[PDB]
C-alpha cells in the first residue's frame, strides 16, 4: 500500500477508447456521437466516463514545436472537444507515445514532454494514454523505462492540471514494480485480441511469462489474465494493472467468453474501458457492460485485486489445444468475498470449492472457516436480450433500468443492501460442505459471498 | 571468506519480529509484554535477543524531515522502548524500506538515509530490517540495488552506533553476491508462509528459480529452502542468507513440518527469528524453538551453511502434487558433521545414506571415509509437551530446564561435551555400512556425527 | 509505422555479397567480374543492385588515422571501384565492424566512426554493412548497443552522402525494437548456413529463442525463420529484419529447400542478397533468384512482413530429428494475400487451409471471409532448367526472358496485371471450402490470392 | 580473429597451480620443491612452464597501501621466488581478485589496481590469475564486468612488464565476447571438481546454461565441457576459453575419465594447468600429462578450438543418472583434423562416424570428402605404467623418454613427421566408409586424421 501519487485512480478507470473499432479514422464528430450514445445508454452514469481519443489525431508540430491537431479531423481544436465532453459530465482522454513517433507513426513525445504535457493541459485534457512505440533504445532495464515514463509524469504535474496518467508500455521492464509512484495505471502486456485462448506468433510470451522481453500483440484473453495473475499484489488504490481494453462486443466471442472476460477484468481491478463500437453494439454485449453487480466488484473501495487460488490443465481442449480451469478469490471492503470458478476447458464441466480454498489465507478454526456464507450469483438479474435490444434501438430508455452510480455511488449502494449490486442469493456454504456448480465451456461462475 | 564488514553477525541473529501475528497493530506495551515473555520463557538466554519492531510504527516526518514515531502507539518515543529492552539484556530492532514508502505505506528512507539512520541511532536502535517496497525503479541490476542498500549501510556507519544491518530485498538482483560487504544478512526470497510445499500464484518463481524476477510472497517452506540451496557458498561469518522468519507456532504446520522447518533454517545458517505470538504459543512449538541442540548447529562458530548432497522427486505427493526427498550435510567447527535426511513426500518412508555421501568432498581412503562415526539424534531429549505446557502456563520455570547460552556459550558447551547440545547417541556408522532410518511425511532425521 | 529515418529502404535491399563464396580473397577484379555477370544475367535489372564488398579489404590506417584499402587487392582505391559500379547502374556496398577489429581481424570502426564514415563517403560508397565483432564490452542492454550503432548512423549522416545503413549485430539486445530510428535493416540472428534444419552447437539458441544471448553462427534456415517469426510486427517501410544472405546456389540444398528458403525470405521482407558465386551458379538456383513473382512479394509497396498463422511438429523427422509444418499469411498493397504452406517434415504430405485461417484477423461475415478468391501459384512459369542453363552458358540472353524491373517497376507491373508477376491461376477458394495441396519434403506451396 | 592484445597467449598457457592440493598452505619452499619436481619429470620442457602461486600468500598492506607478502610463508619476498624460478627457465604466476578481498579473504585489488600491478611487476611476476570474489556489486552486465577487468589489464600494461593476464570470473556476463581485447585467457565456468558427470547443488547451471547467473563451483568435467561447447568460436590466438585446472591425478577419476578430460581440454584449446600434487602424482596420471601427441593438439599454431558435431543422450546412465555421447572435430594448422569420439555413457559402447560428419563444413564432392584419410590414435605409445613409476620413483630419467618441446617446438616436430607427436597409424577412412571403434565407459577415442 501507498497513497495515490496524484490523488486520482482511487478505483480503476472506466470509459471507452475508439481504437478497436475506428483505428486512425477519428474526428470530433465520431467522438461526440459516441459520447452522446454512451450517455444515452446510461453507461456514462454507471461510471464509464473517460472518452479516450487514441492515435492518429495530430498532423505535425508548429514553428514553436507544439503538437498540432489535424484540422480536418478536429476543425475546432481539441479543447473544444473537451468542452463538449465536460458539458455532458464526461472526462476527456488523449494519446501519445514515449517515443519519437506514435505506434501509427504520428509525432511522439520523447524529449518533448514539457511542451506536449502543456499542449494537453491547454486543451483541457483529463487523461493521457502513453504508449511505448519508437522509444529510441530507452528500455531494457527498470531504471531506464522508469525515467522515461517519469519524464512525462513530471511534465504533466508541472502544468498544474490533474491528469489521470495511463502507462502503455506492455509490462516491459517489470512495470508493476515502479508504476505506482509516477502513474495511475500501467498496461502489463501486449495488446489483447478477441480470442479467448488462441496462441499467436505475434504474442510469443505464454501465460507464465509475466516478465516478457517481446510483449507483442494479438495476445488472447487467457494469455493476458495468466500474465496478470502474480501482479495483483503490486496493484491497489491509486495504481492499477491494466489488462487492455475490453473485447466485449468486439469480434466473435461467445456470450460465456464475454462474461468470463468482463468478470475477470473486474475482479483483478483492471481498468474497464469499452473496446466496442457503442453505435454498433449487440444486445448481449450491452448487458455485459451494464452489469452493475460486476462493476461494483471492480469499483470496490480500498480495492484489492483477487488472487488465483489454483490452476489445472484439463484434457478438454479447444481447436488450439488450450484448456485450463481456475479458481480465484479476493476480499471486499465490506467483509464479503468474491469467488470465480473459471472453466477455460472446451466442454461444460462441474466445478467445486470449499470455504478452506475460498478463504485461502485463513487458519483452521478461524471465524471465516467456522461461519456459514450466503452465495450470491453476480450474473443474476442481468438485463435480458429483449430489454437490451429495446434500449439499443432507442425504443426504451436506460433510466430506471441500469443502476445510476452518479446518483448513488457503488459504496453507498452496497451499504443500503441494494439488490442490483449483489445479484441473487442462490444458497449458502457451511463449514465442511462443498460448493458445486456446472460451468459452461470458456465460461464462469462468478459469486459474492456474504456472512449469513 | 571475508571479515564481517562491521564486526557483527559473527553467527546468524536470533530474536523475534511482531509482524506475522500483530501486523500494523503495534505499541510500546506489545513490545515490552512480548519481551518480558521471551525473557521469562528462557528464550532470551538461548540467544533470541533481538526484539524487532516491524512496519507501521511512524506517523510521518517533522518540519526538519525527521521520522516521527506514532505518539499513540509509542507515547514515550522509541529510545524509551530501547532503554527498557536494554535494561532486560535485549537488543532493539526497527524497520524501514529502501523506498519512498514502507510496504504498509508509511514513510520510507530512500534518499533520506542520513536522517533516518540518525533517527535510529538517536533512539538507541541496535538492528535495522531494511525493506524493498516502493523503490522508485532503483532495481534491475546488481549495481543499482547494491548502491541503494549501500546508501543506508554508509548512513548507519556515519552515526557511529553499531547497528546489525538486515537486508530485505527478497534476493533481487543476486543479493548473495554483494550483500556481505555492506550488510550482516539478506533476505534471499519473497515472504515465507505457514505452508510446507504449497505452490502459490503470488510466489511465481519455483524452487529452482534462485534468480527470480518477481520474488512475490506466500512462498512455501520448501520453495524457499530450494531457492537457498545453491546460496550457502556465498554465506558465512558476518553475512548470512536469510530464509525469513520462522513459522513455527504460526498457522497449522504439523509437528514434523515445524521440526523440518526449524532444523533446515538452523542448518543453512539462516537467522532464527521467532514469527509466533509468544503469548499465544503452543507447547510443541515452544519446545521446537527451545531445542538447544539444533540452535548449537545454527550458532556454530566459524559457521558454514550445509550443502544439499542430493534431491529426488518421489511418487508420494501431497494434495498440491508436491513430493521430494533431500539429503544435506555440512561441516562443524569442532570436526563433527551435521546430516539431514529430509522427507518432503506425503508418506512415511525409509531413508538411507553412507559415509561416502555424508562426506561428499572426501576422497576414497581419506580418514573421514575410513573412520567410524557416532550418530547423535539432535531431536532427542526435547522438552516434552507436558513440561512445555507447564512452563507456558506459568506453573513451571524454564530456569534449569532450557539451556542458558548467556551463562555458557554454545562454543564452550560443545567443548565440555554438554549432553544438552549433542542430543543422544543412537548408534554408529562404519565404512561400507549404511545409515537407515524411517522418516515421517514432511519430516526430518537430523543428526550430528562425531568421531568414535 | 514510422517514416524511413533517411528516406532509403522503402523496400528491402537486393544485391550480392562476396563472403559466402570468396571469404577474404577479394579484389577490384572479382567485384567487377561479378557485377558484369549479375548485369548480363539480367539479375541487376530485377533489382539486385547492391554489390556489397565484405570483410578483409583494408591493410591498416594511415598517419591521419584514415582507413587504407589494401593496394594489392584494390590498386586504384575504392572510389574507382564505385565509379565502375555506378557507370553500370550498380550501387556499391562496403563493410566495417562496430568494434576494435572486424570479424576477420582487420581495422574496426569503434570510436573511429567520424573518420570511417568520411572514408566511405570520400570513396562514393552507397551502403554499409556494419558488424558486431570485437565490440569491447559495449553490448548487453538495448541502450548500450543502440548508442554504439547510432554513433555510426550519425557519422554517416554527417557526411551528407546517402548511405543505406545495414546493421549486423545478430539481433543482440532486441535490435528489432531500436533499429528503425537509426538504420535501414538489421540482422536478427547469427549467420545462416546451407542447412535447412540442422541444429548446430555453434548456434546454441533454438528457433523459439528470439532473445538470444549467444547468437553464434551456422544457424539453419528454419532456425532463423523461426527466430524471425515474432519480429515481423517491428519491421516495415524504411527498416527491415534481415535473415542473412540467401544460400540459394550455395552448398547442397535441394531444389525444394532453395524454393522454401527464397520464398520465406521474400515473404517476411528480408533483404534478398545473393550469397552464391554468380560465375559458378547452377541452373535451378539461377531460376530461383530470377522468379519475378516471388521478388514482387518482397518488393510490395508499403510492405508488410507476413505472419505465421500456425506451427505444428510432425512425426516425419529428418536425419537431425527435425520436422515441423507451418502456415504463413500476409496482406499485399493491392488487396491480394500471400499464403505459404511450409512442409518442414521429411516426407511429402498433403497440406490444407481455409479462408478463416488465411484471413486470420478477419471476423466471421466479413467481406474477405464471404468472398471467393482466385489462387495463383507463385512458382508457376519459372525459367526451366534448359533456358537457365543456356543463359548461364552465354548461349542465350536474359533480355526478354527475365522481368525487367528497371524498365517497369514491380508496382506498375502488378497494376497492369502482368502475368510474369502473378504466376498462374490454378483454382479458387470459396467460403466453407478447403484449399488442399501436396507439399514436398522441406518444400513449399507459395500462393497469391486475388479477389475473383 | 584478432591479434593478441599484448603479444602473449599465442597458444594456450601450460603450467601448475598449488590450489587443488595445498590450498592456503603455501610457502617459497613448496613452490621451489614443486618447480624442481616439474623440471626433473621433464614436464617443464614439455611446456608446463608457468608456476602459479594461488590465494593466501599476503599478510596485508603496508603504510603506502602496497601488498605485503606473508613473511612467514615468503621470508625473502616474492621477487626472490621469481628469480629462482627464472633461473630454472620457469615463469612465475601470482594471484589476486577483482574485489575487496580474495576468495579466501586476503586483500583484493579492486580500486587498487595501479599499486597492485606495480607490486607484481616489482616482484618480477610473469602471469596474473585474477579472481571475481567480493566484487562490491560490480557485475551483472557485460559493460560493468569488462571495465573492472580492464582496470587491471591497463594497470599491468602501465608497468611495462609483460604479464600473461588470466581472467577468473567464471564466464560471468558473457566473458567470451569481451575477454580478448584485454586478456589472454578467461575462466568460462565455476570451479571444476574431480567428478566426470555428477550434478552438484553448488553448481546450479547445467551443461546447456552457458549464460549462467550463479557460476558456483564443484561443477563436473562434462558440465564444464558442455558449457564451453558453443564458446570455441570466440577463442583463438591470443585469447582462450579456460575450462579450469586439470583434475588429472586429483581425487578418484578412472584412467578413462582422466584421458577424456585431458584430451577434451587439449582439443578445445583450454589452458593446460596441472592441478595435481606433482610430488604425490600416480603413474597413470603422469603419463596422461606427458602425452606429447595430445599436447601438440592443444599447442597447434594458429590454434582453433574444435567443434562439437553431435550430442545424444543414452539409456546407459551412471549412478547420477548421467549419460551422453559426443563427437567433436576440428582443423589443425598443417591440414590434419582432430576427431574425438566421446563416450559419456556408463557402459563400453561401439561408436561410429564418417568423413561427412568429421568434415562438417565441407560440401559433397569437396576434396576433403573425396579423399582417403589415415587415422592416427593419439593415445598410442603412451608412457607405460612401469616406466612412469620408475621416473616418478627417481630410478629412471625422463630425458630421452618424454618429448622435449624446448629443444624442438611442437610446430617443428610436426613438420619433421615426429612419431611422438602423431601417435600410431591404425588404419584409414575412405569416402562412403564408416569409422568404427569401441569406446570405454566415460572414455574417448581421440584421433588425428592425415591425408594419405
Ligand atoms: C462477428 O461475427 C458475426 C456473425 O457471427 C457478425 O455479425 C459480427 O459483425 C457485425 O454484424 C452485424 C450484423 O447484424 C453488423 O450490423 C455489424 O456491422 C457487424 N460488425 C462489424 C464491425 O462489421 C461480428 N462481430 C462484430 C462485433 O463485428
Ligand atoms: C491452527 O488451527 C488450530 C486448530 O487445528 C487452531 O487452534 C490454531 O489457532 C489457535 O487456537 C487456539 C485454541 O487453543 C487459540 O488459543 C489461539 O488464539 C489460536 N490462534 C490464533 C492466532 O487465532 C491455528 N494455529 C495458530 C497458531 O493460529
Ligand atoms: C554441392 O555438391 C554438389 C554435388 O552434389 C557439387 O557438385 C557442388 O559443388 C560444385 O560442383 C560443380 C560441378 O559441376 C563445380 O563446377 C563447382 O565448382 C562446385 N562448387 C564449388 C564451390 O566447389 C556443391 N554445391 C556448391 C554450389 O558448391
Ligand atoms: C583416490 O583414492 C585412492 C584409493 O582408490 C587413494 O589412494 C588416493 O589417495 C592417495 O593415496 C596414496 C596411496 O598410495 C597416497 O600416497 C596419497 O597421499 C593419497 N593422496 C592424498 C591427497 O591423500 C585418492 N586420490 C588422490 C590423488 O588423492
Ligand atoms: C459549456 O457550458 C458552458 C456553460 O457552463 C458554456 O459557457 C460553454 O459555451 C459550453 N460549451 C460548449 C461547447 O457547449
Ligand atoms: C504535483 O505533485 C504533487 C506531489 O508532489 C501533488 O501534491 C500535486 O497534486 C501534483 N499536481 C498535479 C496537478 O497532479
Ligand atoms: C442473448 O444473446 C446472446 C447472443 O448474442 C446469446 O449467447 C444468449 O444466450 C442470449 N441470452 C438469452 C437472454 O437467452
Ligand atoms: C564504520 O566503518 C568502519 C569500516 O570502514 C569500521 O571500522 C567501523 O567499525 C564502522 N562503524 C560502525 C559504527 O559500524
Ligand atoms: C506434542 O503435541 C503436538 C501437537 O501440538 C504433537 O504433534 C506431538 O505428537 C506431541 N508430542 C508428544 C510429546 O507426544
Ligand atoms: C541526415 O539526417 C536528416 C534527418 O535528421 C535527414 O533529413 C537527412 O536526409 C540525412 N542525410 C543523409 C545524408 O542521410
Ligand atoms: C532442375 O534441376 C534441379 C537440380 O539442379 C532439380 O532439382 C529440378 O528437379 C530440375 N527442374 C526441372 C526443370 O525438372
Ligand atoms: C601495452 O599496450 C600496448 C598496446 O596498446 C602494447 O603495444 C604493449 O606491448 C603493452 N605493454 C605491455 C607491457 O603489455
Ligand atoms: C595404469 O594404471 C592405471 C591405474 O592407476 C590403470 O587404470 C591402467 O589400466 C594402467 N595401464 C596399464 C599400463 O595397464
Ligand atoms: Na461545438
Ligand atoms: Na634463495
Amino acid at each position: 500500500v501507498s497513497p495515490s501519487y496524484n490523488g486520482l485512480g482511487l478505483t480503476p478507470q472506466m470509459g471507452w477508447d475508439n481504437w478497436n473499432t475506428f483505428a486512425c479514422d477519428v474526428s470530433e464528430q465520431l467522438l461526440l456521437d459516441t459520447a452522446d450514445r454512451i450517455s444515452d445508454l446510461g453507461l456514462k452514469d454507471m461510471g464509464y466516463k473517460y472518452i479516450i481519443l487514441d492515435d492518429c489525431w495530430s498532423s505535425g508540430r508548429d514553428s514553436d514545436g507544439f503538437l498540432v491537431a489535424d484540422e480536418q479531423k478536429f476543425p475546432n481544436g481539441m479543447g473544444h472537444v473537451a468542452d463538449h465532453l465536460h458539458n455532458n459530465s464526461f472526462l476527456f482522454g488523449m494519446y501519445s507515445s514515449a517515443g519519437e513517433y506514435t505506434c501509427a507513426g504520428y509525432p511522439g513525445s520523447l524529449g518533448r514532454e514539457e511542451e506536449d504535457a502543456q499542449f494537453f493541459a491547454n486543451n483541457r485534457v483529463d487523461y493521457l494514454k502513453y504508449d511505448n512505440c519508437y522509444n529510441k533504445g530507452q528500455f531494457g532495464t527498470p531504471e531506464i523505462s522508469y525515467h522515461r515514463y517519469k519524464a512525462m509524469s513530471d511534465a504533466l504535474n508541472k502544468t498544474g492540471r490533474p491528469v489521470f496518467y495511463s502507462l502503455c508500455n506492455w509490462g516491459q521492464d517489470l512495470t508493476f514494480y515502479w508504476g505506482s509512484g509516477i502513474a495511475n495505471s500501467w498496461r502489463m502486456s501486449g495488446d489483447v485480441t478477441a480470442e479467448f485462448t488462441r496462441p499467436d506468433s505475434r504474442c510469443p510470451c505464454d501465460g507464465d511469462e509475466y516478465d516478457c522481453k517481446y510483449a507483442g500483440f494479438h495476445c488472447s484473453i487467457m494469455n493476458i489474465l495468466n500474465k496478470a495473475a502474480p501482479m495483483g499484489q503490486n496493484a491497489g488504490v491509486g495504481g492499477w494493472n491494466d489488462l487492455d481494453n475490453l473485447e466485449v462486443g468486439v469480434g466473435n466471442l461467445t456470450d460465456d467468453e464475454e462474461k468470463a472476460h468482463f468478470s475477470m477484468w473486474a475482479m483483478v481491478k483492471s481498468p474497464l474501458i469499452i473496446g466496442a463500437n457503442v453505435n454498433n453494439l449487440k444486445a448481449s454485449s450491452y448487458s455485459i457492460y451494464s452489469q452493475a453487480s460486476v462493476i461494483a466488484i471492480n469499483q470496490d473501495s480500498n480495492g484489492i485485486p483477487a488472487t488465483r487460488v489454483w490452476r489445472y490443465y484439463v484434457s478438454d481442449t479447444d481447436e488450439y489445444g488450450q484448456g485450463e480451469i481456475q479458481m480465484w478469490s479476493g476480499p471486499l471492503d465490506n467483509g464479503d468475498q468474491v469467488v470465480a470458478l473459471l472453466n477455460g476447458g472446451s466442454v461444460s464441466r462441474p466445478m467445486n470449492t470449499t470455504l478452506e480454498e475460498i478463504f485461502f489465507d485463513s487458519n483452521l478454526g478461524s471465524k471465516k472457516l467456522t461461519s456459514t456464507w450466503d452465495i450470491y450469483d453476480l450474473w443474476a438479474n442481468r438485463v435480458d436480450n429483449s430489454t437490451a435490444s429495446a434500449i439499443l434501438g432507442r425504443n426504451k430508455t436506460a433510466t430506471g433500468i441500469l443502476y445510476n452510480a452518479t446518483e448513488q455511488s457503488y459504496k453507498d449502494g452496497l451499504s443500503k443492501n441494494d439488490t442490483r449490486l449483489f445479484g441473487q442469493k442462490i444458497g449458502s456454504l457451511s463449514p465442511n460442505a462443498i460448493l458445486n456448480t456446472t460451468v459452461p465451456a470458456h465460461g464462469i461462475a462468478f459469486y459474492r459471498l456474504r456472512p449469513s
Side-chain angles (χ1 to χ4, degrees), chain A residues 306-449:
Chain A
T307 298
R308 187 221 276 166
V309 179
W310 50 255
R311 185 266 298 281
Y312 301 105
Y313 296 103
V314 299
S315 57
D316 304 294
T317 55
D318 61 20
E319 56 179 317
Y320 308 113
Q322 311 297 294
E324 60 187 297
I325 54 158
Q326 313 186 351
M327 207 221 93
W328 295 64
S329 181
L332 294 164
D333 197 61
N334 75 342
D336 297 348
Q337 197 76 187
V338 212
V339 184
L341 289 168
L342 180 64
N343 182 15
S346 63
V347 192
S348 184
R349 87 191 294 110
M351 293 195 74
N352 65 98
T353 188
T354 64
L355 293 175
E356 298 189 355
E357 291 196 329
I358 290 163
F359 297 100
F360 52 86
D361 292 344
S362 296
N363 301 319
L364 296 172
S366 62
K367 276 194 185 191
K368 285 174 171 169
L369 291 197
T370 284
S371 298
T372 296
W373 294 77
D374 286 342
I375 307 166
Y376 287 76
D377 182 349
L378 293 165
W379 281 105
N381 308 329
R382 115 141 103 147
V383 178
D384 67 29
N385 283 346
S386 272
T387 314
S389 300
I391 293 159
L392 291 162
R394 309 164 221 270
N395 288 302
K396 273 196 176 186
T397 60
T399 312
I401 299 173
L402 306 208
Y403 186 85
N404 193 335
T406 308
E407 190 176 17
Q408 186 192 73
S409 70
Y410 290 110
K411 204 204 112 197
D412 290 359
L414 292 161
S415 299
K416 299 179 186 170
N417 207 331
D418 199 304
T419 302
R420 298 182 303 283
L421 307 184
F422 285 99
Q424 188 100 340
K425 185 180 154 177
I426 58 158
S428 69
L429 219 192
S430 309
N432 322 309
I434 89 156
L435 162 51
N436 62 296
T437 335
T438 297
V439 188
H442 289 194
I444 197 174
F446 201 48
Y447 305 123
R448 190 168 182 139
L449 296 210

Side-chain angles (χ1 to χ4, degrees), chain A residues 4-8 153-154 156-163:
Chain A
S4 170
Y5 93 105
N6 64 354
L8 298 168
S153 186
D154 291 346
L156 290 167
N157 186 273
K158 191 195 189 202
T159 71
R161 183 185 182 86
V163 177

